[PDB]
């Protein structure tokens, strides 16, 4: 009865050079029991991209919660919100239930449309902000993520290259970590083209 | 309540459910129905806190037929699934949640597609080609990874699921008495009444 | 306590025992657990005697302002599930309440609901409820067939409180038994067990465990 | 309190 | 007490009318014209902004046509701070009914709400009514494409092709004098505009003083696309058709 | 005339209309007289009836066991104030264990009445109540009227030619206050009283009610056969 | 929920022929800590009542306050407050014991047991118990905590029943309650030499008695008293 | 919360805002039901100084309240569908706590108590709708015709039409429904009620609107040719 | 405008008086008590002859013991139905017990005055209450808008009250037997009623304490009119 | 953590004649080993012939009558005088138990009188409001003593007829309130000697069509 | 949480 690590998961998110990944496994379960092997976490409002790990209910909630209030956004400032605005956003709907909060780890990734900068982004469940150069990891393989990033991650890595060493991060990660893998997802994000990859991992 | 299963085959929806209520060491009844019709071609099982079960299915009932009844119009299976699964998310933080599990086996005539959705008493959905609540899962899961194919005939899906029943008659420490079958299809829903 | 109500040709049989208890003390041998609702509606109780008692009087007024708006006896199924939704608002309150409501009407003809207090309603054609369920279960389902006749059939019902009324420890006092017909209910009076049992083991020759 |  | 100076807002007169309602629509018919023309593979939006000044700010300005979600936008007629009110409300119960049921709201349903809440400003509450007109254009993949009025009384109608605010007895005359069924968007464009030319009290109908918008599945391949016209687009599509 | 709209608008001369138009109820209401001794306390009342077919509306309410009032006016203003008494008398009684004062019950129904005469929307009570008691300090009668003006008197009458019986209790006062420890000359002389106020009917039985209470007499009434007594 | 903190020990009272008794030493005590020695736990409602209040001190200085406001209510629109219509004991305790009931039943209770000694306006004697369980009970003699154990065993040989209460003089009464004080000294670890007394009469009316003092102690013995059993030095 | 008390007794004892809500129904298309053996038949007016509509998206002036219950209406649409959202809610709430559909009475009954609520409650003006409720009772194959109005008051009604110049299609109704034989059949019963609209509407084209409802929830609406066929039946009888 | 509860110079509530002329306009409504029992008989008055009769409901059960008949705005009438039902069964499941005839009447009285700026507007309607109890016996009263109830032998409401409670003053004496009270309200409301009177259009109904509150049938309403007419052609 | 609840011990007893009906109670209240008062009555006359007792707390006990005594006054009010009979009263108090279901009055209660056919009639109830006519009933901490010794003096249970080979039971007969008395007097001197929390006095009301007379009587007092 |  650990809200954070009953459904099990992980997100990673990492800065290249005039590019961002996030990435995500695919597993959902109810503790030991593995239920499905489609349940990706993360989501997209525009160009800025939002991965949750923690309580899927909350994962689920959140996505609909903030594609709502994204949506409203576009239709009053008559434009897409920016990474850095979207951020706030979510730390001020997270500390709105401060005593009764969402079970849930969200990491921000995108590249601001008008001054062409990564820009990455991790929260507690509480809404604090982890503000990053380098990358944000969370979920139950988190302590595994921070060692796998800390050692393979170099700063100014090409598209191909980041894409490679972020795969690397999260699928060894994964494979230390009873509730997390079952396949994974990795978004390469470009000023305006975004490739979407599925990983082959070890399904146990 | 306890076994309530789903398989999604080629055309159809199939829900197996156990026909046994027990309270305390008694088989109060062995003919136990634990689903509800929401709109013609939508079917809901549920399993889990006596009382909670049928009071949230009833409940579910009344405010798709409602919605039925106000557009002339039956909502996807895809809809109803959505809405169901906020009611429980709303009820999780209430001051008594429904303790309720639901499998919803739906067709969508626009789409001509058979949809499974497995929702918990969280609020926790996914669409999955095969679903199971409580420790059924723990068995028919295993058994399916292996068995299952996705274009089967509701045939194949029948015994596929005899396969399952059969098994957890095996290996199940609880006599749940049976299961009631029931098909949801272009046609609406059939119960087998012979399983 | 121990209740059972059971379906068959001639109508619905209701027997109830008559005891009341405080842990081991026996408050009383002198209990009514059968209200009479309506001519074609009777109610059980088994549980907390204040909350089976309370509520199942408070039932009967609902079913009477039901009749005065609706100028038609309440069905069997609307009377059950009047209590059943009053209980579940209550649900972890602690209310402990274990009700069978019993009764005939033209549109359902015999009906019996299983109502409990944690929300539970079920209808079906035999139920044994109290702690003394197992006990007349026993007696009851290895006699049970549908076609037996209004005399066989009452007999059944009364010794199956008898069955659980000598086994169970917090079971006894006397048998009451109720015969629900299209005609309404008829009463088929209050039999001590302290002379049932005697009168029984030496006709029926049963009651074997028992020195005679 | 009486218990039935 | 406060009762001698109560209007009495919500009420009726001898003849069964409720006199606010009717004061309100005598309001909204000195508004600048709204035109809405549905054709079978799109909708036109055109509404004449009300006397335009020369210092204006014409291409950051938003007075007469709204957007709710991305496949429905109104037209409005009447007091523009009340619209605002109706339309912020309206926006919000698109993304309600989005939350809950995971598909865009049914265009009829949102109108519906919409002209529900009018509703009540008539029957309770001793508050005046909303002096507003909408013309609502969506698209749905239950009806397609659907034009609906609101008036402050509440109720609301579907058309092929309506107007509303000032002169619609002369634009319902002409729309149903050249409207046909079979009619495309780049012909329902040319009939809104020639519309708005002869039923406007201005001199000459110039790209200054108009609104312009169209929901088209002119996307790539089943999807809708919403264009809200920018002041030099209206300027080429005004000279296009041969009005200036 | 034009400050007569509501309870909240003063006259010009600083009258209130919508008072004195509830005084004016009053006076429509069949007469009721109260008188008292040092011993006893009794209230006459002539009930009214809408005909011969119809019952005669009941005049005199109890209170407490030594405490009640009879009315004169619109008799669901009194049910709602007579109700509000007992529920006084009852609160000093599990509270204090003490019977309330019947001047405190008249402090109490002049608070009460004096709330609706001074706030927007509320109406002045359509009644006068004439309130008899014996408490620690003897035997008591009261006049309510609802204006909020309660008055402690020997004697006096209310309602539709309650003048006669007045000005008879003004001139028998001398004789009547010292009618002690004898109940039924001392209803004989608010029989007498109430007589004064008859024009062409006279008291039959069941048009007859007279209420008592004393040093050893709880509040009680009598109606019926019961005051064929005192014809 | 409370804990009470600064309490005060047995108040303890009896009947005799004519009138009340009641007495309570003048402590307020903090746990073990004998902290405060001015306090009067005595408290008379007009001239014909006195409340005695053991418990909490912070809720007996409430109650002070709550009887001070009755005395104030009572004489408001009352011409016959100082005779007829003045506060009975019976009518003084009646309200305290509806307070303190309804405070139980809140959950949230006056930390207190009170006694309500006096006279009523026909002469009678009046002496009623009340506690923070709202539980009421009357006897010819009644004591608080410690009194209840000590105290009414030695009250009870002088009036054991309602036909002694006659026989009993305000000598004999007053003797008994001022030995009774001298013992609760002797053996409560949470009492104090200095008390008040007062007596109720209905004829000689109200007497307060301030700064009495527990006198003639035996002590002499203790000098014999050497070691646990075996030690003879 | 508003308060003012709109609905008020006048010194001739009449309520002036119920009746001026009888005027907004009188003002209203016309609405006629007529019950016959096993069938009931609901016919509507649409007025046709409305041409450029959209009929597949309109409001349909006949509204299911349950599959087996139907209620058209004369007066303000805008109010007519408060009440219909209620009865709807109603139905479905009965549905969940007596196990079994609403009488066509109860429904009725439920409608006309919320019209009356209206009627003396402060801050709110009455509803300016009267309504026509049809339907068969679960279970029963005796056809029910209710009328409700602005005041609250309920009736059954053999035949009864609401709404402007009603008085001139109850007076064709009053003669031409026999109460010892209503119309036996489906097409005796509809044409009956084409013939009392055809009286007011003007033309038979795109004016009626007919919907049929029968036994065991069995309610359809008819479309313009099978309409157009009644009126054209109806004309040919009468040069005569 | 001006306030609701309102007095006029004469000391009367103008709301309640205009309600009075509201149920004058009502159709009759006719009610005699009698030692064999109360008979309670109204004038239905459809509307239109397409209406069908036996729906129009004037007569009411609030208890086994106690039956009402509503004269004005009948509608006005369901709410305060309602509150006396609820009321009977209430006080039944309090007390074990009948609730006697004049408490349920005070409590349906209690509703009347509870209107103000509760209720924006007194009742239109006003009902005669008729029942029997073990301690005062058969009863009949009369419950108005005022909040005021009266006690009668035999009163008329409606239309036609004047003239129906002038010929009820003359008739009733306190030795009718219950076939005497049937024909006599049937014998005055065919004297104050517009329309002819037979089975469909006026409704006869009675309490006994034996039989408890009886709403009579069309076929047995319409021998007692036969044997009314006969009775009144025989001299 | 406070308590609401205390014990004040003592025990009554209810016993239904023919035309009469007595409510016992002893006169001792208690708390833990301490005697409180010797003499403080616990059985009221609530008026309309209707005796009460609700032993267990004192404090919910007083609470109690005091309600059902104030609902008396409220029904004469209410009900133009009518007289509260005891099948009436016992539904009214049902009530006022069950409406502090969660937080109960933890009293037993008995009232008695006489029935409308003018027998003599005893009632009883739990804590919470289930209640019950009958011929007898004991309540209160020596109720488990003195019950059973009513079963088998007042409904001559386990009592057979001489010389019937236990075939015919003692028939059931109505005993005098002579016959009654001695038996309250038997049970409370037997409940006195072998309960610590029952003795001091005994205080008996008994109930005829003529009213409620009292008799007194002395119990030991250690 | 994250702390500080
Ligand atoms: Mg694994
Ligand atoms: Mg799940
Ligand atoms: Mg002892």
């Not at chain 3, 009451?176 to 001590?192: A, C, F, P, R």
């Not at chain 5, 036109?44 to 991305?70: C, F, G, H, M």
């Not at chain 10, 309960?195 to 003529?210: N, P």
Request: net charge negative.
């Amino acid at each position: 009865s650990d809200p954070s690590s009953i459904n099990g998961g992980i997100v990673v998110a990492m800065t290249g050079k005039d590019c961002v990944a996030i990435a995500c496994d695919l597993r959902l379960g109810s503790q030991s029991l593995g239920v499905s092997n489609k349940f990706e976490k993360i989501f997209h409002y525009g160009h800025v991209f939002l991965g949750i790990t923690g309580l899927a209910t909350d994962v689920t909630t959140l996505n609909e919660m903030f594609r709502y209030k994204t949506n409203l956004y576009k239709l009053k400032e008559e434009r897409a919100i920016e990474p850095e605005t979207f951020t706030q956003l979510v730390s001020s709907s997270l500390y709105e239930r401060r005593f009764g909060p969402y079970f849930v780890g969200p990491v921000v990734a995108g590249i601001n449309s008008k001054s062409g900068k990564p820009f990455i982004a991790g929260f507690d469940l509480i809404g604090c902000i982890d503000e990053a150069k380098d990358f944000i990891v969370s979920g139950t393989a988190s302590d595994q993520l921070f060692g796998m990033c800390e050692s393979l991650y170099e700063p100014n890595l090409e598209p191909e290259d980041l894409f490679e060493t972020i795969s690397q991060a999260l699928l060894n990660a994964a494979d230390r970590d009873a509730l997390s893998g079952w396949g994974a997802v990795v978004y390469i994000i470009k000023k305006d083209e975004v490739v979407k990859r599925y990983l082959k991992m070890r399904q146990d | 309540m306890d076994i309530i299963l789903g398989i999604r085959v080629q055309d159809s929806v199939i829900l197996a459910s156990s026909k046994a209520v027990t309270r305390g060491i008694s088989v109060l009844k062995d003919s136990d129905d634990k689903t509800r019709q929401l709109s013609p071609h939508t079917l809901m099982s549920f399993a889990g806190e006596a009382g909670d079960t049928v009071q949230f299915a009833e409940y579910i009932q009344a405010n798709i037929q409602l919605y039925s009844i106000r557009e002339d119009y039956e909502l996807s299976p895809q809809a109803v699934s959505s809405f169901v699964r906020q009611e429980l998310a709303k009820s999780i933080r209430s001051r008594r949640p429904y303790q309720v599990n639901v499998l919803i086996g739906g067709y969508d005539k626009k789409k001509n597609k058979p949809e499974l959705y497995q929702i918990d008493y969280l609020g926790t959905k996914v669409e999955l080609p095969y679903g199971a609540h409580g420790y059924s899962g723990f068995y028919t899961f295993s058994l399916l990874d292996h068995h299952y194919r996705p274009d089967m005939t509701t045939e194949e899906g029948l015994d596929l699921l005899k396969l399952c029943v059969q098994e957890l008659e095996k290996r199940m420490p609880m006599d749940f008495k049976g299961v009631i079958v029931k098909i949801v299809d272009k046609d609406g829903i059939r119960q087998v009444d012979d399983f | 306590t121990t209740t059972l109500a059971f379906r068959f040709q001639g109508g619905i049989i209701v027997a109830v025992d008559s005891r009341a208890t405080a842990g081991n003390w026996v408050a009383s041998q002198t209990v009514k657990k059968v209200i009479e609702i309506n001519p074609f509606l009777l109610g059980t109780m088994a549980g907390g005697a204040a909350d089976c008692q309370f509520w199942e009087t408070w039932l009967g007024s609902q079913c009477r302002l039901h009749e005065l708006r609706e100028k038609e006896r309440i069905s069997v199924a609307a009377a059950s599930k009047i209590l059943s939704n009053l209980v579940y608002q209550y649900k972890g309150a602690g209310l402990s309440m274990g009700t069978m409501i019993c009764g005939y009407t033209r549109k359902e003809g015999p009906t019996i609901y299983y109502v409990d207090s944690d929300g539970t309603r079920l209808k079906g054609d035999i139920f044994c409820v109290g702690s003394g369920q197992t006990f007349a279960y026993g007696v009851l389902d290895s006699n049970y067939k549908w076609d037996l006749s209004v005399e066989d059939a009452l007999y059944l019902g009364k010794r199956s409180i008898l069955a659980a009324a000598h086994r169970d420890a917090y079971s006894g006092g006397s048998v009451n038994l109720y015969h629900v017909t299209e005609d309404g209910w008829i009463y088929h009076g209050n039999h001590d067990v302290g002379e049932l049992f005697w009168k029984v083991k030496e006709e029926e020759g049963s009651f074997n465990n028992v020195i005679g | 309190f009486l218990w039935x | 007490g406060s009762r001698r100076y109560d209007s009495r807002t919500t009420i009726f007169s001898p003849e069964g009318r409720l006199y606010q309602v009717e004061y309100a629509l005598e309001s909204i018919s000195h508004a600048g014209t709204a035109i809405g023309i549905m054709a079978s593979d799109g909708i036109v939006l055109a509404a004449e902004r009300k006397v335009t000044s020369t210092l204006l700010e014409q291409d950051t300005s938003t007075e007469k046509l709204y957007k709710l979600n991305d496949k429905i936008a109104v037209a409005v007629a009447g007091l523009t701070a009340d619209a605002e009110i109706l339309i912020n409300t309206a926006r919000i119960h698109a993304q309600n009914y989005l939350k809950t049921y995971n598909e865009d709201i049914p265009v009829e349903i949102l109108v519906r709400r919409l002209s529900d809440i009018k509703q009540g400003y008539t029957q309770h509450g001793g508050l005046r009514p909303f002096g507003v007109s909408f013309i609502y254009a969506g698209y749905d993949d239950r009806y397609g494409y659907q034009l609906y009025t609101s008036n402050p009384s509440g109720n609301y109608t579907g058309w092929k092709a309506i107007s509303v605010g000032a002169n619609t007895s002369a634009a319902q005359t002409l729309l149903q004098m050249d409207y046909k069924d079979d009619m495309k968007v780049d012909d329902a464009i040319e009939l809104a505009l020639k519309t708005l030319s002869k039923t406007t009290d201005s001199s000459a109908l110039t790209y200054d003083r108009l609104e312009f918008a169209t929901i088209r599945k002119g996307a790539n391949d089943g999807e809708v696309y919403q264009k809200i016209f920018k002041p030099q687009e209206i300027k080429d599509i005004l000279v296009k058709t041969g009005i200036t | 005339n034009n400050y007569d709209g509501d309870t909240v608008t003063f006259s010009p001369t600083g009258r209130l209309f919508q008072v004195e138009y509830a005084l004016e109820a009053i006076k429509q209401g069949s007469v009721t007289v109260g008188l008292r001794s040092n011993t006893h306390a009794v209230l006459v009342a002539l009930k009214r009836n809408a005909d011969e077919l119809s019952s005669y509306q009941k005049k005199i309410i109890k209170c407490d066991e030594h405490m009640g009032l009879s009315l004169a006016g619109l008799a669901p203003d009194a049910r709602v104030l007579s109700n509000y008494l007992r529920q006084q008398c009852n609160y000093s009684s599990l509270v204090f264990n003490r019977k309330l004062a019947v001047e405190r019950a008249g402090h109490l129904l002049c608070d009460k009445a004096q709330k609706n005469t001074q706030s927007y929307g509320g109406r002045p009570y359509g009644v006068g109540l004439l309130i008899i008691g014996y408490d620690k300090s003897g035997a008591h009668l009261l006049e309510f009227q609802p204006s909020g003006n309660v008055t402690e008197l020997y004697g006096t009458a209310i309602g539709a030619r309650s003048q006669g019986a007045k000005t008879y209790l003004e001139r028998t006062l001398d004789t009547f206050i010292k009618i002690d420890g004898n109940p039924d000359e001392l209803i004989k002389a608010g029989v007498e009283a109430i007589s004064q106020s008859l024009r062409d009917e006279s008291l039959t039985v069941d048009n007859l009610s007279i209420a008592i209470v004393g040093k050893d007499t709880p509040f009680t009434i009598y109606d019926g056969e019961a005051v064929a007594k005192y014809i | 929920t409370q804990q009470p903190i600064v309490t005060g020990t047995s108040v303890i009272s009896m009947k005799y022929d004519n009138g009340v008794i009641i007495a309570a030493d003048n402590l307020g005590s903090y746990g073990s800590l004998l902290r405060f020695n001015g306090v009067e736990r005595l408290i008379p409602v007009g001239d014909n009542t006195v409340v005695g209040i053991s418990g909490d001190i912070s809720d007996m200085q409430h109650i002070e306050r709550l009887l001070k406001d009755l005395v104030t209510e009572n004489a408001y629109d009352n011409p016959l407050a100082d005779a007829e219509e003045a506060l009975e004991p019976s009518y003084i305790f009646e309200y305290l014991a509806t307070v303190m009931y309804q405070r139980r039943s809140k959950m949230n209770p006056l930390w207190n047991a009170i006694i309500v000694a006096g006279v009523q306006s026909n002469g009678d004697q009046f002496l009623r118990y009340v506690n923070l369980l709202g539980v009421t009970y009357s006897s010819p003699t009644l004591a608080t905590g410690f009194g209840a154990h000590m105290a009414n065993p030695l009250l009870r040989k002088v009036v054991d029943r309602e036909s002694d209460i006659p026989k009993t003089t305000v000598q004999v009464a007053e003797e008994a309650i001022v030995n009774a004080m001298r013992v609760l000294y002797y053996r409560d670890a949470r009492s104090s030499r200095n008390f008040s007394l007062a007596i109720i009469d209905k004829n000689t009316g109200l007497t307060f008695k301030k700064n009495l003092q527990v006198e003639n102690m035996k002590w002499d013995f203790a000098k014999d008293i050497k070691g646990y059993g075996t030690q003879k030095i | 919360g508003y308060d003012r008390a709109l609905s008020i007794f006048s010194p001739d004892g009449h309520i002036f805002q119920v009746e001026y809500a009888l005027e907004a129904v009188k003002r209203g298309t016309c609405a006629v039901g007529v019950k016959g053996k096993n069938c009931v038949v609901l016919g509507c007016e649409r007025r046709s100084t409305l041409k450029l509509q959209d009929t597949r998206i309109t409001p349909s002036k006949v509204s299911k309240i349950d599959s087996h219950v139907v209620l058209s209406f004369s007066g303000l649409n805008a109010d007519s569908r408060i009440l219909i959202e209620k009865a709807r809610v109603e139905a479905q709430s009965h549905r969940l706590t007596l196990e079994d559909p609403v009488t066509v009475e109860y429904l009725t009954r439920y409608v006309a108590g919320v019209q009356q609520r209206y009627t003396q409650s402060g801050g709110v003006r009455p509803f300016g709708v009267s309504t026509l409720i049809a339907g068969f009772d679960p279970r029963d194959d005796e056809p029910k015709l209710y009328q409700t109005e602005p005041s609250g008051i309920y009736s059954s009604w053999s035949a009864q039409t609401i709404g402007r110049n009603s008085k001139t299609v109850r007076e064709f109704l009053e003669k031409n429904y026999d109460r010892k034989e209503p119309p036996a059949t489906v097409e005796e019963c509809v044409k009956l009620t084409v013939r009392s609209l055809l009286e007011v509407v003007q033309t038979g084209a795109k004016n009626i609107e007919i919907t049929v409802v029968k036994p065991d929830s069995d309610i359809v609406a008819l479309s313009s040719e099978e309409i157009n066929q009644y009126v054209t039946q109806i004309e040919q009888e009468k040069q005569e | 405008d001006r306030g609701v509860s309102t007095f006029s110079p004469e000391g009367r509530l103008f709301q309640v008086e205009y309600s009075l002329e509201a149920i004058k306009l009502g159709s009759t409504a006719i009610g005699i008590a009698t030692k064999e029992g109360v008979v309670l008989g109204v004038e239905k008055r459809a509307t239109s002859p397409l209406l069908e009769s036996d729906s129009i409901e004037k007569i009411v059960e609030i208890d086994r013991h106690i039956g009402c008949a509503m004269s004005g705005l009948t509608a006005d009438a369901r709410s305060m139905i309602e509150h006396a039902r609820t009321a009977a069964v209430t006080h039944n499941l309090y007390y074990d017990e009948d609730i006697n005839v004049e408490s349920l009447t005070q409590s349906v009285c209690d509703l009347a005055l509870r209107f103000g700026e509760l209720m924006s507007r007194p009742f239109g309607v006003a009902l005669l209450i008729a029942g029997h109890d073990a301690d005062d016996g058969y009863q009949l009263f009369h419950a108005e808008p005022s909040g005021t109830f009266y006690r009668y032998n035999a009163k008329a409401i409606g239309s036609g009250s004047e003239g129906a409670q002038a010929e009820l003053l003359n008739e009733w004496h306190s030795s009718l037997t219950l076939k005497e009270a049937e024909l006599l309200v049937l014998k005055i409301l065919k004297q104050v009623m517009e329309e002819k009177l037979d089975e469909n259009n006026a409704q006869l109904s009675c309490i006994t304490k034996q039989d408890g509150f009886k709403i009579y049938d069309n076929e047995k309403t319409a021998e007692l009119i036969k044997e009314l007419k006969e009775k009144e052609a025989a001299e | 953590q406070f308590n609401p609840y205390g014990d004040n011990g003592g025990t009554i007893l209810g016993i239904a004649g023919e035309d009469f009906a007595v409510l016992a109670g002893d006169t001792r209240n208690i708390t833990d080993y301490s005697i409180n008062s010797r003499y403080e009555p616990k059985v009221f006359d609530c008026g309309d012939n209707i005796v009460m007792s609700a032993n267990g707390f004192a404090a919910d006990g007083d609470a109690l009558v005091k309600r059902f005594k104030n609902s008396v006054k409220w029904y004469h009010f209410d009900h133009n005088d009518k007289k509260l009979s005891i099948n009436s009263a016992a539904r009214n108090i049902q009530h006022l138990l069950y409406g502090k279901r969660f937080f109960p009055y933890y009293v037993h209660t008995i009232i008695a009188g006489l029935d409308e056919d003018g027998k003599g009639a005893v009632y009883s109830f739990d804590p919470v409001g289930s209640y019950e006519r009958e011929q007898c009933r004991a309540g209160g901490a020596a109720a488990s003593l003195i019950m059973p010794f009513l079963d088998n003096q007042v409904n001559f249970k386990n009592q057979y007829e001489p010389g019937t080979n236990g075939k015919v039971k003692k028939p059931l007969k109505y005993l005098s309130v002579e016959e009654v008395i001695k038996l309250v007097r038997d049970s409370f001197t037997s409940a006195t000697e072998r309960h610590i929390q029952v003795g001091d006095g005994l205080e008996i009301l008994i109930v005829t069509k003529d009213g409620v007379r009292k008799e007194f009587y002395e119990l030991k007092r250690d």
